[PDB]
Amino acid sequence: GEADCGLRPLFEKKSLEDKTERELLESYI
Amino acid sequence: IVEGSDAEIGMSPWQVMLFRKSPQELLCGASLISDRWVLTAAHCLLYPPWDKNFTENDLLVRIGKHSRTRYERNIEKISMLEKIYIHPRYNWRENLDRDIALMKLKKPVAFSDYIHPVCLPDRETAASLLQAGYKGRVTGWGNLKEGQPSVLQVVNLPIVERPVCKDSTRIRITDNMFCAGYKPDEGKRGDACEGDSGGPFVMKSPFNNRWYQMGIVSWGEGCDRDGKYGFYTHVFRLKKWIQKVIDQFGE
Amino acid sequence: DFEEIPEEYL
Ligand SMILES: N[C@@H](Cc1ccccc1)[C@H](O)CNS(=O)(=O)c1ccc2ccccc2c1
Ligand code: NA
Numbered sequence: 001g002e003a004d005c006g007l008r009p010l011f012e013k014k015s016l017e018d019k020t021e022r023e024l025l026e027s028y029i
Numbered sequence: 030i031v032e033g034s035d036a037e038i039g040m041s042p043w044q045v046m047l048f049r050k051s052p053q054e055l056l057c058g059a060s061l062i063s064d065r066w067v068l069t070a071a072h073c074l075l076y077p078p079w080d081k082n083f084t085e086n087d088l089l090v091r092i093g094k095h096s097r098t099r100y101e102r103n104i105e106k107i108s109m110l111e112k113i114y115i116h117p118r119y120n121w122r123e124n125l126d127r128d129i130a131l132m133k134l135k136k137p138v139a140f141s142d143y144i145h146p147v148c149l150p151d152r153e154t155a156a157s158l159l160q161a162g163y164k165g166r167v168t169g170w171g172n173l174k175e176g177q178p179s180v181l182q183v184v185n186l187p188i189v190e191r192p193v194c195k196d197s198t199r200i201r202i203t204d205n206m207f208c209a210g211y212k213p214d215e216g217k218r219g220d221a222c223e224g225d226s227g228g229p230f231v232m233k234s235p236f237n238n239r240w241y242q243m244g245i246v247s248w249g250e251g252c253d254r255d256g257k258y259g260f261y262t263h264v265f266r267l268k269k270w271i272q273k274v275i276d277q278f279g280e
Numbered sequence: 281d282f283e284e285i286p287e288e289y290l
Contacts (some may be wrong), residue, residue, distance in 0.1 A: 003065055006148035006239035009141070010039030018040050020166075021233055023185050027164035028235050050290055053282050089289055100283040107289045 030168050031253035032219040032228075033184035038095060041143035041168045044181060047093040047227060051062075056083075058169045058228025060242055061092055061146045064137040066275060069227035071119040071130040076205045078121070081142075085110040090134065093143035095181050098160025103144050110135040114274050116267065120187050126203045128247040128262045131274050138159040147231060148241045155265035158232050158243065161190040165209065165243055167259070175252040184219035185263050189258050197258055198250060201265065205266050207244060208258035221259045222252035230261045249258055 011018055043180035045067050057073035067090055073085050093105040111133045111218030120126035138144060150158070164185045170178055186209045194208035202208075209230065211217045221228070230244030251257060264271075 001148050001151070002146055005146050006241060007142075007145070008039060008042050008240070009145055010042075012238055018037050018182075020183070020185055024164045024233055025235055027162060027187060028158070029142065029162070048282075048285075053285070055282075089285075098282045098283050107285060109289070 030167060030171060030178070030182035030184050030219070030225055031174060033167075033182040035182035036095065036168060036183045038084050039142050040183065041181065041229075042093070042143055043147035043229065043242075044094070044168050046094055046170065048089045048091050050087060050089060054087070055097070055170055055224055056223070057226050058171070058246065059090065059132070060229040061138070061144070061148055062137065062149060062242070064140070065134050065279065067132045067134065068131050068242070068245065068271075069132065070128045070129055070247055071115045072121065072125060072247075073167075073227040074113055075115055075119070076121055083113070085113055090132065090166075093141060095099040095143075097178055103137045106138050106144060107171050108136070108138055111120060111135045112278065114278070116270055124201050124203065125248050125260075127205050129245060129267050129270070131271065133278065147229060148239050149268060149271065150243060150265045152265065154234060154241055155243070157267075158234065158241070159188060159207065163186055163188050163232070165230045166208075167221050167225065167230050167246060169221060169225030169246065171226070172222040172252065175222060175254075186219055186259070188260045188264065194258055194260070195257060202260075205263050206247065206260050207263055208260045209244070210258035211254040218253055220249065220253035221246045
């Protein structure tokens with residue numbers, strides 16, 4: 001897997017959440 | 030995408046558009062897995078019953094996009110293909126088993142706020158996250174109904190139980206596919222639709238906060254129909270073929 | 281329907 005893969009410059013990288021990723025996290029029960 | 034919403038800017042920086050040179054048109058979606066490799070669905074390139082068979086020179090890839098139709102000056106990077114690889118056991122005759130393909134770009138694309146690769150899962154990530162009820166995310170510029178979006182669209186959809194998937198269709202379902210979508214009881218809606226194929230079904234690991242590409246938008250019977258689900262290529266199950274292609278032919 | 285892309289790409 002590529003070192004920095006899957007971390008988004010305008011979100012993960014600056015620790016901002018997008019509008020609906022919490023819905024995903026809430027689904028991982 | 031049907032019943033989705035507008036993407037935020039830089040929300041899906043691995044989203045790639047497959048774009049036909051002549052006529053100039055959207056063929057499919059795709060995703061960036063490294064600076065020289067783009068992943069898509071085999072049927073976006075080869076589907077003989079509809080006389081579809083693109084070679085490298087028929088196609089361009091457009092990375093960093095948000096608007097469907099705009100040429101996004103200083104934001105997007107358009108790339109030419111060096112070579113296309115279609116899974117040797119891709120089954121276009123029967124059920125789109127192994128609906129996967131890689132495209133190698135002629136030069137590295139430069140990463141930016143708008144351009145960044147997605148992770149591919151490992152066995153443990155797949156075992157952990159590919160569970161009925163767990164939601165992933167589908168993005169694309171495809172039809173808004175079974176009309177067309179101004180900007181990249183997004184919807185989050187739950188993975189559905191294997192039996193339910195099979196009981197929804199007369200097509201023979203393989204272990205290289207999973208379906209996702211809300212049930213009629215579940216109230217909510219949403220689906221991939223025409224033009225979204227090849228694009229990524231992704232999930233964000235709660236363990237390392239990374240986005241992983243779990244599926245590739247493969248097929249459905251209509252878009253957002255009650256009692257029907259979208260089918261996705263199971264990326265981990267085909268990862269050895271991926272690694273093989275990249276290791277043999279990449280640098 | 282699509283905006284014209286630079287000809288360097290075509
Ligand atoms: N958006 C398309 C995707 C597609 C296009 C061409 C070939 C395969 C898939 C629709 O989902 C296609 N819908 S379909 O015509 O009902 C269909 C569904 C399942 C199939 C399975 C194997 C082969 C062809 C299929 C066509
Ligand atoms: Na449905």
